[PDB]
Amino acid sequence: NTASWFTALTIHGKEDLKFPRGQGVPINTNSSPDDQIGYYRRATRRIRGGDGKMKDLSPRWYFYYLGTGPEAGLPYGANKDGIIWVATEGALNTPKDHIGTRNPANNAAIVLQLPQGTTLPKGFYAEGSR
């Protein structure tokens, strides 16, 4: 019923997802500068897979706007394992109820894209590539 608006950010390795301050918010042209704030949550569920379903086993992090998702009531900066906070310069510290979450039966996920100039996290590239 509820899901991230964006595809997963897979972090290939045993390191938390991190972004320098002012970076890490996925691009969404249907959002305003005041909205660019939220959290990434590490997915708990393991990959069951099946025929032709071959996802990388490394931890997946899903972006949720502030005031939405499984940690909707957490204030910005709250310390919780598997939760990392991100905010673009100019974003307002208010719940983004008007964006909300995605219903995976009705809308496809937006491919997660980060803007140029973003410092890419350690583990952004799969093992054996770089």
Residue numbers in the entry: 48 to 177
Share the article's original sentences.
One central protein involved in the formation of regulatory ribonucleoprotein complexes (RNP) is the coronaviral structural protein nucleocapsid (N). N plays a major role in RNA genome replication, translation, and packaging and has further been found to interfere with host-integrated stress responses and stress granule formation. The N-NTD possesses a peculiar, hand-like three-dimensional fold, with a β-sheet palm and several flexible loops, arranged as fingers around the central β-sheet. The latter, together with the extraordinarily long basic β-hairpin finger, constitutes the positively charged primary RNA-binding surface.
The importance of the central core network is further supported by the mutation of residue Q58. To restrict its polar sidechain contact to W108, we exchanged the bulky glutamine with a similarly sized, yet non-polar, isoleucine to maintain the local steric dimensions. Like the other core network mutations, Q58I had a reduced melting temperature. To unravel the structural basis of network-disrupting mutations, we solved the 2.2 Å and 2.0 Å crystal structures of Q58I and S105I, respectively. The comparison of our WT structure to Q58I and S105I reveals a strongly deformed β-hairpin (basic finger) for both mutants. This is reflected by high RMSD values of 4.552 Å and 3.198 Å for Q58I and S105I with the WT, respectively. In contrast to that, the Q58I crystal structure reveals a complete disruption of the core network Q58-W108-F171. Interestingly, phenylalanine 171 in Q58I is flipped out of its position, demonstrating the propagating effect of one single mutation within the core network. This influences the structural context of the carboxy-terminal stretch (171–174) in Q58I recapitulated in the Q58I R2 relaxation rates for residues 172 and 173, which contain significant contributions from conformational exchange.
